[PDB]
Amino acid sequence: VLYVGSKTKEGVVHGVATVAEKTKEQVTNVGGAVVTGVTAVAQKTVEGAGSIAAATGFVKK
Amino acid sequence: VLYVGSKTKEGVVHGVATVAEKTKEQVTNVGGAVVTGVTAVAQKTVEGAGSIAAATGFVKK
Amino acid sequence: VLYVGSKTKEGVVHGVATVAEKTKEQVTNVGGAVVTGVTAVAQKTVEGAGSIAAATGFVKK
Amino acid sequence: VLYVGSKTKEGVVHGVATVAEKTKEQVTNVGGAVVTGVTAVAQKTVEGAGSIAAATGFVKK
Amino acid sequence: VLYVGSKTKEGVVHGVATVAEKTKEQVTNVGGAVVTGVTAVAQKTVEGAGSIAAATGFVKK
Amino acid sequence: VLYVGSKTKEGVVHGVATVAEKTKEQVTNVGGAVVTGVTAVAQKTVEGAGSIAAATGFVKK
Ligand SMILES: Cc1cc2nc(/C=C/c3ccc(O)c(Br)c3)sc2cc1N(C)CCOCCF
Ligand SMILES: Cc1cc2nc(/C=C/c3ccc(O)c(Br)c3)sc2cc1N(C)CCOCCF
Incomplete structure (x- = not known):
């Protein structure tokens, strides 16, 4: 509270x-999916997922 | 509260x-999907997902 | 409140x-999808998703 | 000669x-004499003295 | 000669x-004499003295 | 000669x-004399003295 x-x-x-x-x-x-060359990155997340360099192949169903 | x-x-x-x-x-x-060359990036998210360099292959159904 | x-x-x-x-x-x-060469980017999001350099392959149905 | x-x-x-x-x-x-903050300097001298950042106190006689 | x-x-x-x-x-x-903060400097001298960051106190006589 | x-x-x-x-x-x-903070310096001298960061106190006579 303070x-x-x-x-x-x-x-x-x-x-x-x-x-x-x-x-x-x-x-x-x-x-x-390919993620290459990520530098000098910063963030802040409140009540949520926080991802910086995420490669997801695919989502099949 | 303060x-x-x-x-x-x-x-x-x-x-x-x-x-x-x-x-x-x-x-x-x-x-x-391809994400290359991301530098000097910053953000803040409140009640939401926060992504910087995210490559998702595809979404099949 | 303050x-x-x-x-x-x-x-x-x-x-x-x-x-x-x-x-x-x-x-x-x-x-x-391809995202290349992102530099010196900043943002703030309130009650929403915040993405900077996101490549999504496609959305099939 | 070539x-x-x-x-x-x-x-x-x-x-x-x-x-x-x-x-x-x-x-x-x-x-x-004071020389401060010299950056990204280049030169070429033929038959002569070449100085970039030289501070000489004084010349008394 | 070649x-x-x-x-x-x-x-x-x-x-x-x-x-x-x-x-x-x-x-x-x-x-x-004071020389401070010299960076990214290059030169080439032919038949001459080559100095980059030289501080000489003084020359008395 | 070649x-x-x-x-x-x-x-x-x-x-x-x-x-x-x-x-x-x-x-x-x-x-x-004071020489402080010299970085990323390069040179080439032909028939001459080559000095990068030289501090000489003084020359008395
Ligand atoms: C957006 C926000 C940002 C925010 N940043 C704060 C303090 C940082 C800090 C506080 C105290 C410190 O000593 C230091 Br250091 C740092 S409170 C705050 C409240 C809010 N909202 C209005 C939430 C509304 O939600 C929208 C609903 F979807
Ligand atoms: C200024 C000069 C610069 C110079 N740089 C050379 C080759 C470098 C090299 C040669 C062969 C290589 O395989 C390689 Br790698 C590198 S020759 C040459 C000649 C001269 N002059 C005309 C001297 C005149 O003097 C003035 C009188 F005061």
């Missing part, structure tokens, strides 16, 4: 330096 | 420096 | 520097 | 991403 | 990502 | 990622 927060950080990404030197990147997808 | 927040950060990305030197990038998708 | 927020940040991206030197980028999609 | 150069690079800076988040920067100089 | 160079690199800086989060930077110089 | 160089690199810096989180940096110089 929250007192100072300099609070929830779901934060800071101070990031990345270098990527690639000569050839290739992705070949046939019918499925 | 929140007192000072300098609060929820779902934040800051201070990011990225370099990408690629000679050839190629994506070939046939019927599925 | 919120007192000072310098609050929710779903924020700041201070970002990116360089991309590519010689050839190619995407070939046949019937599916 | 040079054949292809894709030659001399004194080159490329593909650089920098971020600087400072709250207070202060310089106080009394009688001398 | 040079054949292909994809030659002399004095080159590439693919660099830097982040600097400082709260307070302060320089106080009284009579001397 | 040089044949392919993909030659002399004095090169590449693929560098640095992060510096400092709360307080302070330099106090009285009469001398």
Whole structure:
């Protein structure tokens, strides 16, 4: 019934330096799911599912 | 019934420096889902699902 | 019943520097979904689903 | 007496991403020399001295 | 009397990502030389002295 | 009398990622030389002295 927060950080990404030197990147997808190259991502979810890099193949019935 | 927040950060990305030197990038998708190259992303969701880089193959019935 | 927020940040991206030197980028999609190259994105959602880079293959019935 | 150069690079800076988040920067100089904050600099000198960030105090006689 | 160079690199800086989060930077110089914060610098010198970040106090006589 | 160089690199810096989180940096110089914070520097010198980060106190006579 009383929250007192100072300099609070929830779901934060800071101070990031990345270098990527690639000569050839290739992705070949046939019918499925592919998630590649996710960087510097942050989030906060209240009463819900929280996903960042989720690959689901498929949903058959 | 009483929140007192000072300098609060929820779902934040800051201070990011990225370099990408690629000679050839190629994506070939046939019927599925592909998510590539997601950087410096932030969000906040209240009573809902929160997804950033989600690839779902398909939904068959 | 009483919120007192000072310098609050929710779903924020700041201070970002990116360089991309590519010689050839190619995407070939046949019937599916492709999401490539998402950077410096931020949002906030209240009572709803929040998606940033979501590729869904298809919805069959 | 014969040079054949292809894709030659001399004194080159490329593909650089920098971020600087400072709250207070202060310089106080009394009688001398100060060089601060030099980034992404390139040069080429033929028959001459080549200096980038040189601070000389003074020259007395 | 015959040079054949292909994809030659002399004095080159590439693919660099830097982040600097400082709260307070302060320089106080009284009579001397100060060189601070030199990044991503490249050069080439032929028949000459080559200096990047040189601080000389002073030259008395 | 015959040089044949392919993909030659002399004095090169590449693929560098640095992060510096400092709360307080302070330099106090009285009469001398100070060189601080040199990163990602490259050079090539022919018939000459090559110095990167040189601090000389002073030259008295
Ligand atoms: C959207 C929202 C956001 C939100 N953020 C808060 C405090 C963060 C904090 C509080 C205290 C602290 O000390 C610190 Br640090 C941080 S309360 C709050 C309430 C709400 N709503 C109105 C919910 C309505 O639901 C919609 C129905 F579907
Ligand atoms: C400036 C210069 C630069 C230079 N760079 C060369 C080859 C690099 C290389 C050669 C062969 C290789 O296989 C490779 Br890898 C790399 S020759 C050359 C000659 C000269 N001059 C004209 C000298 C004139 O002097 C001025 C008098 F003060």
